[PDB]
Ligand binder design. Structure first.
Ligand SMILES: [Zn+2]
Length: 121
């Protein structure tokens, strides 16, 4: 469908657009672009889990002051350090109507799911 906005569930700030999204291994969504790196901060994790396709390194959070809502983890995939976000952490809003949706699982959120390509980086 049309491009869509993802807002910090807790603080509503603008995180990114569906267009910036890319999918790794079919069920891991990351966000291309520098703009997005301006929205979250990484906090190292002392007891990182051990996922299958990537290596966890930290939890990322809304940069916003007095928000710091949990958005997801930051990882090493192949040779890139990239974020991996949780849909539940956001609110999907349609630009032209402001209708906002709360998804709990990407399986249910339906947009153009472009497979992550190292080209774009
Ligand atoms: Zn926030």
């Amino acid at each position: 469908k049309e491009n869509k906005k993802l807002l910090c569930r807790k603080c509503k700030a603008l995180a990114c657009y569906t267009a910036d999204v890319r999918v790794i291994e079919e069920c891991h969504y990351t966000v291309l672009g520098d703009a997005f790196k301006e929205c979250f901060v990484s906090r190292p994790h002392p007891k990182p889990k051990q996922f299958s396709s990537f290596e966890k390194r930290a939890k990322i959070f809304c940069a916003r002051q007095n928000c710091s809502h949990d958005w997801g983890i930051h990882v090493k995939y192949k040779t890139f350090e990239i974020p991996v976000i949780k849909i539940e952490s956001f609110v999907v809003e349609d630009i032209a109507t402001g209708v906002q949706t709360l998804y709990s699982k990407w399986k249910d959120f339906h947009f153009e799911k472009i497979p992550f390509d190292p080209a774009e980086m």
